[PDB]
Structure formats: C-alpha cells, structure tokens
Amino acid sequence: TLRTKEQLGYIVFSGPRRANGIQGLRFIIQSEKPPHYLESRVEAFLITMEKSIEDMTEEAFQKHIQALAIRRLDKPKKLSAESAKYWGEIISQQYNFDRDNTEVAYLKTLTKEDIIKFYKEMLAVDAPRRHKVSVHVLAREMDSNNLSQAPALPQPEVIQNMTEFKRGLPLFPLVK
Amino acid sequence: NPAIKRIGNHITKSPEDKREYRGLELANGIKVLLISDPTTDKSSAALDVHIGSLSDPPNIAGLSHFLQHMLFLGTKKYPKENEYSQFLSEHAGSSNAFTSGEHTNYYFDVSHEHLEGALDRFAQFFLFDESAKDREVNAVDSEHEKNVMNDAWRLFQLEKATGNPKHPFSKFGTGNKYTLETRPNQEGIDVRQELLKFHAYYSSNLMAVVVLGRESLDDLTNLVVKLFSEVENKNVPLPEFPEHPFQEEHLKQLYKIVPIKDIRNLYVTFPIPDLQKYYKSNPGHYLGHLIGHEGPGSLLSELKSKGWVNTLVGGQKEGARGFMFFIINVDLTEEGLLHVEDIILHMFQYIQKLRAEGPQEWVFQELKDLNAVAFRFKDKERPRGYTSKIAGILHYYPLEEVLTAEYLLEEFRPDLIEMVLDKLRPENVRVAIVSKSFEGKTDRTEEWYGTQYKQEAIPDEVIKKWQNADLNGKFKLPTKNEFIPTNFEILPLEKEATPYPALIKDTAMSKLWFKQDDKFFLPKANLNFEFFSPFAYVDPLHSNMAYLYLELLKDSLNEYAYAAELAGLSYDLQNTIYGMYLSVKGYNDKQPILLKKIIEKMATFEIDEKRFEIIKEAYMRSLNNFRAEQPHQHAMYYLRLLMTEVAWTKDELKEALDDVTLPRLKAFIPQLLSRLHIEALLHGNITKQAALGIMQMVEDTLIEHAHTKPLLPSQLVRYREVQLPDRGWFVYQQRNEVHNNSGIEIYYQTDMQSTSENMFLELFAQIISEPAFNTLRTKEQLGYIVFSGPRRANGIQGLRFIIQSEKPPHYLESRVEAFLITMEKSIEDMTEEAFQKHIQALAIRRLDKPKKLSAESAKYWGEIISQQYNFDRDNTEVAYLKTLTKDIIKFYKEMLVDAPRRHKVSVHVLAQAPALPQPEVIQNMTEFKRGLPLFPLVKPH
Amino acid sequence: GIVEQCCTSICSLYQLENYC
Ligand SMILES: [Zn+2]
C-alpha cells in the first residue's frame, strides 16, 4: 500500500519496537512528501487495515498465525546467531531462553476478536489508551514551519525541549 | 480595682519591640504579665507553677508529672476529656506543658478571636476520672519506656541516683505504671485521692501567668482578673534545699558507665551554691564563657591539637533553689579515653591559670555589650514559647526586669567569681567516664533504667597530681573579638523592592534570588547557597567523601569561626543529595568577610591526617549508632528510602566508608569543585548591588582558586518518587535491636502536588488531627507517640500516620483502618458549620505570617529547593480553600478501603476493625523500585 | 561552650505534635 501503490518512498518499514522492557508499534517512512501528508496516509492505512482484519477470513488469519509461528521458531543457522539470541535475552535481563515455545504456544490460542479489541483499544484514533509519538524530519529545502479518506486528527503538542518533555511524564517499571 | 493588689510601673523592653506590656500582681498572689499586640494572628497564654517533681511524695514517684498529664482530661465546668484540645484544634490552636524539678509550666496558643473562649477552660484546669487515670497510666509508662534507652536520660537519672539517696534530688520524676498504678494498688493507695490532695500545693501565691493577644491591656486586665481572681490562695512556701545532695562521700568519685550507643564521653562536675540570686552578674556564664571557650589559647584548642578531644562544653547547670552544679563535658577519642587523667589535669591547669590571672573586667564588659546588642536586636519570638518562657521566669525576677534579667548584666563583682573559682578544686570534683570499653567490667545496676555502672574512689595520688598543677604555656586568655558588629545602619528600602524574592541574576554559573527586608528592618541577613554537583551523590563512596570533606572543613574552621558565632554571626554547612548547602546568618556588618574566609577554605583546603582519621572514626561511630535510633525514626528513614528513586542505606555507606582513603579524598575535592552549579537566596539587610557583589565575590573566588566551571543544563537531574499501583498495598518489615518498643508508619500516596489536591489533603488532615490523637492515644492508649499529617517529597504528597507503641503493627494498622471508617461516618454526619469551622481553622493555620527573618527565608528556601517557586502559594491556596464543600467525601472515596486508586505502603519496625487484604512483603528495595513506576516532576514556574 | 536552655532531658512536653 505505502510503496507499491502510493509510491511514497523507497524505504518503508513497520513492526514491533522493544526497548528497556517496554514495547510498541513503529512505522518508519522516508519520502519526498511532507511528514503530515505521510502521517495522514499512515492513519488512512491504519483504518484500511482495521477493515481488512474485520473482513479477513479465518483461514488467512490462521495462515498469518502459522507464518508468525514459523518466523518465531526459526532455528539459528550459526553459533553467532544462537549466541546473539542468548545475548539478547541476557541484555534484556529477562533470561527467557524458552521464549519461542511459550509465545508460539500462546500464539496459537489468540482470536480475531482479541486482535480487533486490541486494535480498537490501543491503536484506534479514538482509542482510550492511545500512546502516540511522531518524529518529523523536514527535507533540506523545506524552510522552518482516488486515495482513501483520512480521519480527523487532534491537535498535537509540539515538543520544544526533550528534557522538559521527559520531566513532566512518568516512567515505566522494569520487567521482572 | 479591688482584685488587683498592685500594678508594675513599666516593663523594661527593647526599643525595637513594638508589643505593649503591663505587669501586675493580683490579691491572691498570682504574678500576671499582659502583652498587647494588635497585629498578631494567633494569641497565646501560659500559667506556671513553681512546685515541680522534686516535691513528689516518697512513695509515689512522678505524681506531679501524672498530674500535669491528668489536668488535660476535663474539669468540673467542662467534664469532657478532649473538649479542650478539640476546641483548640477547631480554632487553629495547640497546647502543651512540661514539668521540671521546680516548675510545672502549661502553655497554649489559639486564634486571636477566641482567646477568652480557650482561656476560660485553661483557667478551669486550675479550679480526675478513674478510667482516665487507668488509661493515662499507660501513656506515662509509654513515655518512660520511650525514655529508657536514651543516653541522656540514663546519665541524668544515674546522676540523680549516685547522690544522697535520702535527698529529693534522687527521686524519679517521670514515674511509670509500677510507681503510679501497681505499687499503690499493692499498698492500698488511692491515686485519685492523692491527685485531689496534691492539687495543697497548687496555690495562687506560687503561680505566674502571661497572656498575649490583640486585645487592649485593659481588656486583658479585666479578663485575667475575672478568670483568675477566684483562684484560692493557700500560702504555700516555696521549697528550698540548702543541703547539697552531693556530700563528701559522693565527692572525688569515679563512675564508669556503659552507654547504649557507641559513644565516648567525659563528665566533670563541681557542686556549687545556688547562683540564681546573682543574676545581675552571672559568674557561671562568665566562667562558662572562659572555660568553654574554643578560640586560640583555649582549653579545647589544646585538647584538639593533642588529638584527645573534639568538642568541649563547660558552664553552670541549674540544680535547685539551694544547690547548683558547674559541669565540663567533653567527647573522647580512642586516645583520649586512655588519657582522661591528663585531660582533667589540663582542665585544672586552665582553672589554675584563671585563678592566677584573676577576674577580667574587660571580658565582663565585652559580654555585657555583646548581650546588650543581641538582646536589642533579638528576633520576634513565637507567642507560645515566649509566654511559656516568661511565665517560667516570672518567679525569679521582679515584674520590671522579667524581660531583661537573664540577658543584661549591670554590676561587675569579682568576689563571687573568685569564690566559685575557690569552689572549683580537686577536693570537690566528680568524674564520670562513658565508654563501651567498660562492658562487662561493671558491678552496679541502676534501679529505674537498668544502667550498668561501676563506682570507684579517685586515688589521693591522682588528686595530689591535680592539686600540684602548674601553669601551661598553651593556655592563654582569649583576645579581643574582631567580629563584634559596629555598623547597625539599616539600608533604605529600594524603590524596586519586591514583596516576594526576585531573580536578579540567571547565568550558567549561578542563579541568584534576592529580596530586601521590608517587614522586620533588623540589621541582620540570611545568605543561603546550594552547590549542585553530580559527584556528591553518585555512589556511597563519594557521598561519604563529601560528608567527610564538609565535616573536616567545619572542624578546621571551628576555632576561627567560634568568635563570629559568639558575635551573633553563625553559619551552617551540610551535605545534601543534590550537592553542598552553605548558609551564613546573622549581622551583615562583618558577614562578607567571614563568608569570603569560608569560601577560601573551600578552595584551599589542606587535610590533616589525624583530624581525618579521628573524624572518619566518629562518622563510623555515627553510622553504627543509627541502630539505636527510635522505631518511628527508623520507620521514617525506611519510608524515605522506599519512596525516593535513588537512596543509599547507612549499611552501604558504612561498608563503603572503609575504602575511603586520604589520596582518594584529596583527588576527590578538586574533582567535586571542577564542575558546579550554584543556587543562592540572599534575604536580609542588604541591597541589590551588595548581593550582586557578594555573589560575584563567591564566583570569582571559586573560579580563581578552584577553576570551577558551570554545569550543563541536561545534567540537572532531579529525583522522582516511586509510584504505587492502584489498590496496591506493600509492607516493609524490619526489627529494632535496641528498643523494646515497636514502630509503625502508614503512608497513603496521592496523585501530585496541585492546589486542589493540596487543599484536599490539608483539609482532611485538619479534620482528622484531633480525632486521630484522641482515638489512637487518649482512648485506646496504643502508645505515647501518635502522629498524623501530610507528607510532601519530590513534588508528590500523601497522608502519613506515625505510631510508636508496644502492640503489634498489624493491630495498630487495623485500628487505623477502623478509625478511617469512623472518620468517614463522622464527616458524613458532620454539619456544614463545623466543616466551615475546619475551613477557617486551616485558613488561619496557613495564613500565619512568619515572626522572624529566618523563618521567612526558610519558607523562601523551601520554595526554592522544590523548584516550584510559588511564593504566593498561601494566598492562592487559601482562596481556593474557602471555596471547598463537604468534594472531601469523593476524595476519600477515590484516594483513601475499596478506593479505586488506593496507594498504601506500611513500615513495620518490630520491638471493630475491617478486613484487610493480603499485603505484599518487601524483600528487596531495589527490586521493589524496579517493579513499580515513577512519578513525574513538578513543572517550574 | 556554655550550658544552654534545657540541654538535659527535663523538658517533657506532654505531646509531640509540633516536631517535623
Ligand atoms: Zn509529659
């Protein structure tokens, strides 16, 4: 959608972001168009993905579950890869060396309703616990400041100083 | 007036004192003093009796203490037990009382518009339920039990018991459950009848009252006459004790005492006649000034240079109307404990030097002028303590000199001084050594406190060595004090003066707040400074090196700064989790000079290795001696560690203390002074250009000698408070290995520090204050120490209960919860007039203006450390407080048993109630902090 | 340097609700 169809940019990434024991979903896009237009396209893509999950069949849903199980249970091909996994589990201080088996065994139990409620609770535009942070990087020449329908977005709080942004916010605990 | 026997002519007061005074003596013998102040927000009153605990019956020890305890639980005209404290609490007032061997002083304060309403009942106190007695016995017993493991109490009662046992000085003044309840019940004594028959000594001829209020002297006169003319006069003679409790068989004796804390002290005592009647000269204050001196050529200078003593105290100690003492107490190093005989020998060498030189009229004159200046420019005291002090000293001095007797010296008589010096002789000495090295070498036990000690006779050979003491060249008379202020000029108020502190300088090096004194107009100043540096609290090693650096600095500057400290110019220098803290307070005449000297010693410090080892060992003894603190203090400490993000325990500091070395410290001082921030608050009798000159002086000295560079703003890291989860209860449990009593601290946490939440918490704490005291202490008699109030730290607040009791902390906690439900029902059934009465009481509590300069500068500094800079907080928060309604119920349902956001943490220090959930025991503080979130920081202004 | 106002243990105010 974001590369083959709309042709925003060459680099389009999306996936899980884990750091300091806390996680979230991340999208990374580099393009020529302004970041606000890019962000509207990302939101419209998010609603399109909501309708896609809603209209998704159980066989394809089980196909995604199985594909994620294959990606999670992919055995390391070399000693530096296995030691990279173990060293990740050590640096994270979670020490869950049997993580793949348990997380896949629980992955085969999830349901489309669980996914829908998760999206509507954490990722929707009107979600009660939405935690959104956007980083915009303008182009070089940009001075200082048939497509789907984009939803109405609230007024964002522009950050002036990172330290001031952090002092007024709480901190998450560590993973036991 | 017929009810007034006489009226004083005029009260000798200071020309700077705007309060009005009028002294008089009623027909019944009560010595009355009246103080009119039309500007005070709270009035006060105090009544003093001159009997005390030395007149207790021989079979009932502590009867006057128990009576003082008992007079607060209702009278004839007002029989309810806590109607007095409930009235004062509902009218923004408080009360208390103490009982010394020759006094029993009651005192209280209240709002200025209900002085008569409280004073009527306070007069009913002096014009006994069985259940109230049986209950309060446990409060007295918990008081004595609180005072059992206290070293000062142990040595005090041991000094009482080592004298003549037949003398009343040997009596036990506190009393306990045995002497008040168990023994009288075993001997068929009616304690209530003893209270009624003792309340033969509470005569009007031995009473001194002091009343301070906004009303006129005539209204106060008619009030005190009306309410106190009915006090019956029984003409009780004042008790005197001409025979000294220390006879010959008690003199020239050595007492080896084993303490609880690991302390090393030496006590020298000389029995002397009562010098009270010599208040016009004060030879005990003269000889105390010379002997206890700390400047060059003093005794403490030699005792410090020899590495035997660190601190010395010497002067006159009050005994009674017939006997007094003259004491010299010092601290002992590991070498001083073995050279006690040599230390005492140097003491008698200094005394012999004073006998050889003779009295010094120039020293007496210097003390006279210094005390005259310090008295003339004395800060305005608080009404309660002021009325209590004057009421206490009214029995000793006439009405005209009651305000200036203990302060102003007028006549110089050397016969008295030479007589006391003749009394300071080895044949009239008493020596007591306190050290742990006497453990297992004692054979005697004190009865009341169980103190282990040993009694020996001082060898006549040692006494002879003391008698042949020659003159020491290291002992010289102190020189002329160069810190005596001579410039009392009040700088005129600048046109740009601000009612609140203003930010007149904000650079990368420092941040300077300044305000010219516009309320007190006294020639004084408070100069506060805070030095931020991340190496101060980075780890226990660097924190220990910082405390050792500051302690070595103050110890090195003590001899030089003792003259300025004696000249009304004092300073405090303490380490904080954010960096150093230096405060210079006093007369601004010679303030910048001494301040410059202190900075010079900060940037040119040369560490002595002997002082380093002695002070290091002393700090080790302190961290070791924290285990003997009281259980509630341990609870506050543990709660502090739990709630703060970063905090090093005294076990970590104690373990890291052994790794501190002199090269590490000498390499650590310039590392600390290499990168600094400065936040200053200059508030006093100085101008803006003077404040800028002082600040620039400090900066230029620090840069010149220490090469100090400013800090990066991103390095200004404040600490957050641990955020408790919703409906979460955590309990940390430890044991107290010293006291046989248990402590407990319950803490409920709130969201943050905003106006609404502050007034919610403060209003609720105002409603539950007196009910908490009365329910947890007066009725149930859990313990002697019961406290409840708001707790603020790191910009987050909450409610805290602190109880010290014998009963287990789980029972105490269940009773706390049941009390919470009881207060829920009480507030739900409370009337709007009582609610608004608590609103008004809190408004008067918060809008109370500071009486002296140091309190105002302390409020400003309190608003600076929190980095909220809300100087108008009182007006805004009270203006919002008067708009609150019986919100408090929803606040109680939201933050305080089944609340959806209940945050509860309990600290249990080992020695109908609702059902409580299963608490999560805290095994490790670090895991506790890692598993829980942190609160944000309060935004700056 | 000199004995000050109530440096002994004699000062026993009935209740401590004014400290800290
Ligand atoms: Zn008491």
From Swiss-Prot, chain B:
Residues annotated for ATP binding in this entry: 382, 848-854
Cofactor note: Binds 1 zinc ion per subunit.
Motif extent (SlyX motif): 806-811
Chief location bin: cytoplasm
Modified residues (N6-succinyllysine): 146, 650
Effect of residue 239 to G: Reduced enzyme activity
Effect of residue 781 to C: Increases catalytic rate towards INS and amyloid
Binding, Zn(2+): 65, 69, 143
Localization annotation: Cytoplasm, Cytosol; Cell membrane; Secreted
Recorded catalytic activity of this chain's protein: Degradation of insulin, glucagon and other polypeptides. No action on proteins
Assembly behavior: Homodimer. Can also form homotetramers.
Name listed for the protein in its UniProt record: Insulin-degrading enzyme
Native organism: Homo sapiens
UniProtKB/Swiss-Prot annotation, chain C:
SS bond list: 6-11
UniProt protein name: Insulin A chain
Organism of this sequence: Homo sapiens (Human)
Name of the encoding gene: INS
